[PDB]
Scaffold this active site. Structure first.
Site, PDB file in Angstrom:
ATOM      1  N   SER A 183       1.064   4.669  -1.827  1.00  0.00           N
ATOM      2  CA  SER A 183       0.548   4.436  -0.433  1.00  0.00           C
ATOM      3  C   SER A 183      -0.815   5.144  -0.280  1.00  0.00           C
ATOM      4  CB  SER A 183       1.603   4.834   0.598  1.00  0.00           C
ATOM      5  OG  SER A 183       1.219   4.521   1.908  1.00  0.00           O
ATOM      6  N   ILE A 271      15.826 -13.466  -5.943  1.00  0.00           N
ATOM      7  CA  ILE A 271      14.521 -12.830  -6.316  1.00  0.00           C
ATOM      8  C   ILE A 271      13.468 -13.898  -6.589  1.00  0.00           C
ATOM      9  CG2 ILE A 271      13.273 -11.481  -8.040  1.00  0.00           C
ATOM     10  CD1 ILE A 271      15.815  -9.693  -8.416  1.00  0.00           C
ATOM     11  N   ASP A 450       5.575  -5.797   0.753  1.00  0.00           N
ATOM     12  CA  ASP A 450       4.866  -4.666   1.407  1.00  0.00           C
ATOM     13  C   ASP A 450       4.027  -5.209   2.597  1.00  0.00           C
ATOM     14  OD1 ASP A 450       3.158  -2.495   2.021  1.00  0.00           O
ATOM     15  OD2 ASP A 450       3.256  -1.744  -0.135  1.00  0.00           O
ATOM     16  N   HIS A 486       7.320  -1.324   1.177  1.00  0.00           N
ATOM     17  CA  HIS A 486       6.221  -0.352   1.010  1.00  0.00           C
ATOM     18  C   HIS A 486       6.735   0.856   0.215  1.00  0.00           C
ATOM     19  CE1 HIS A 486       2.536   1.589   1.320  1.00  0.00           C
ATOM     20  NE2 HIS A 486       2.890   2.478   2.256  1.00  0.00           N
TER      21      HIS A 486
END
Ligand SMILES: [Ca+2]
Length: 561
Positions: A183, A271, A450, A486
């Site tokens: 991040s 997925i 994210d 995230h």
């Protein structure tokens, strides 16, 4: 005084002692010997070590607040010869335990592996630099030097102080130095490779905010994009962006994404490995709800099994990314992915929606990008000059954001703000040759779901790096994580040990052809465990055609079909 001893440790404090700090304004507050600590349910055992903490460049900012760059360093008695720095998060301002986080939901700390470990608060302190007139713990942004400290200078000062302490305590320099951040911490790792190429030999940069001053531009955009789908007003008369979509709505969208996209990698498994083919194929305005075989987009009135044309317009505009009047992109677009939701037992994934929408079950706006930390950070930290204002005004400011005027403010200087937020915080350079040519290796990772920073924007940086530096995969590889939010969370393989393969790449030249990962919440697929290879961009995980679909050994990294 023997090397690597309690006496060597305590000598680092005196200041009348022998110790020479690269920065003359370095004050050591603590130099204490720490006994080995046992393993716990959540942390690996810590060895016996010297803990040093203190501060560099204590001063008064132009706002009248105190500033300093705190550090905490831990030097094991029994040392593997490696130096380790961990990255920050949010707008920093706190000083961790400094045992060296390696992220990826790992139990092991770098200190538990006999690295010497350091951390910083990045030049301000959330306990003291908390200004109720400049939106709380983002108030460091009123001080020009506190900005430069947050952007680059704190990490540089603390890296030098750490290596000087290591050389004194052990009587030799580290063989190799490693940095791991996610991040704000991933931005820091990319900033180190660009601005300070010889500070670290190995860098892991997870979900890197390398264009962080643009985050608030995305936020104004997603806020205004979603406002038409909002239901009700907050106390200030701002639409409840959090009411634009229920958790059931987002689960419906993710199911539709799986209906279009799941099998594009050769395996139906919840997925989306083929993220590129997915972006080519999926449009919520034409896709099917595969539960009922009808269009996702409502034809009549809203039901649980459809999204209104207004919801579809809103989410498509939010995901497309901000433009000015000329139609120039100001950030990037975002990937459609299943990790926008997910269901584990009874629990809907909150890890995508918290960024642009916030909690459904609330009479107030609480999204990061509407009224939360990210919107506040943009106004006080990244806009030049800064725009401090009461917290109740933040959502209205995002609603009246002007994409021709406001975005110029991340490139401007003004009075004592002599660098723009893109100058001090941004880390957009692809000039990595000095890093590569001294043996530097960089592992980037990013979750496809994210909502803080676009996985696709990291991929575009990586593309520009490969074009500027032919053969870039020899020193830098990117691992995209389908389904992950995230830094962690969401329906994917979000857990991995990045430090082991980083060390192998830096010290043995062994490039990661894949990195083992496993799901922290395998409930999302209704299984006990799922392990998959993460693949170096542009490769994806391909099922070999037989075996347990939950076992890594049945997958290989390959070009998309
Ligand atoms: Ca699949």
């Amino acid at each position: 005084v023997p090397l690597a001893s309690r006496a060597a440790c305590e000598a680092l404090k005196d200041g009348n002692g022998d110790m020479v700090w690269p920065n003359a304004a370095t004050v050591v507050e603590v130099a204490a010997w720490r006994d080995a600590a046992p393993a716990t349910a959540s942390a690996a055992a810590l060895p016996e070590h010297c803990e040093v903490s203190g501060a560099i460049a204590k001063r008064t900012g132009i706002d009248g607040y105190p500033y300093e760059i705190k550090f905490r360093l831990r030097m094991p008695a029994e040392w593997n010869g490696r130096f380790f720095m961990e990255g920050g998060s949010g707008t920093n301002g706190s000083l961790s335990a400094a045992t060296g986080s390696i992220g990826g939901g790992q139990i092991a700390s770098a200190l538990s592996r006999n690295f010497a470990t350091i951390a910083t608060d990045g030049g301000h302190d959330n306990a003291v630099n908390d200004n109720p007139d400049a939106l709380g713990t983002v108030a460091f942004g009123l001080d020009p030097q506190a900005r430069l400290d947050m952007g680059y200078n704190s990490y540089d000062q603390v890296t030098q102080a750490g290596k000087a302490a290591v050389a004194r305590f052990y009587g030799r320099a580290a063989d190799k130095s490693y940095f791991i951040g996610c991040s704000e911490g991933g931005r820091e790792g990319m900033m180190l490779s660009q601005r300070f190429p010889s500070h670290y030999d190995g860098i892991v940069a997870g979900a890197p905010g390398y264009q962080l001053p643009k985050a608030g531009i995305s936020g104004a955009w997603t806020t205004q994009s979603l406002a038409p789908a909002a239901v009700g007003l907050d106390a200030q008369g701002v639409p409840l962006i959090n009411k634009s979509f229920s958790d059931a709505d987002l689960h419906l969208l993710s199911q539709a994404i799986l209906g279009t996209c799941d099998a594009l990698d050769g395996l139906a498994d919840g997925i989306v490995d083929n993220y590129r083919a997915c972006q080519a194929a999926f449009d919520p305005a034409t896709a099917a709800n595969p539960a009922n075989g009808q269009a996702l987009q409502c034809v009549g009135a809203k039901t649980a099994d459809c999204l209104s044309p207004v919801q579809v317009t809103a989410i498509k505009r939010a995901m497309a990314g901000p433009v000015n009047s000329a139609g120039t992109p100001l950030y990037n677009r975002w990937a459609w992915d299943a990790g926008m939701s997910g269901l584990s037992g009874t629990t809907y994934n909150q890890g995508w929606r918290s960024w642009w929408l916030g909690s459904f079950n609330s009479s107030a706006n609480n999204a990061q990008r509407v009224s939360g930390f990210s919107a506040r950070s943009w106004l006080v930290d990244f806009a030049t000059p800064p725009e401090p204002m009461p917290m109740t005004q933040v959502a209205a400011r995002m609603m009246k954001f002007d994409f021709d005027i406001d975005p110029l403010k991340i490139w401007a200087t003004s009075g004592q703000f002599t660098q723009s937020s893109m100058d001090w915080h941004g880390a957009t350079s692809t000039d990595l040759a000095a890093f590569r040519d001294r043996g530097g290796k960089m592992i980037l990772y990013h979750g496809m779901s994210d909502a803080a920073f676009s996985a696709l924007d990291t991929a575009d940086y990586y593309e520009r790096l490969g074009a500027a530096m032919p053969g870039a995969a020899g020193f830098a590889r990117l691992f995209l994580v389908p389904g992950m939010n995230h830094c962690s969370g969401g329906p994917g393989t979000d857990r991995f040990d990045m430090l082991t393969p980083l060390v192998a790449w830096v010290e043995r030249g062994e490039a990661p052809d894949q990195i083992s990962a496993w799901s922290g919440t395998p409930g999302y697929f209704g299984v006990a465990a799922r392990t998959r290879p993460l693949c170096p961009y542009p490769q994806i995980a391909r099922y070999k055609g037989s075996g347990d679909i939950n076992t890594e050994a049945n997958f290989a990294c390959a070009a998309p079909p």
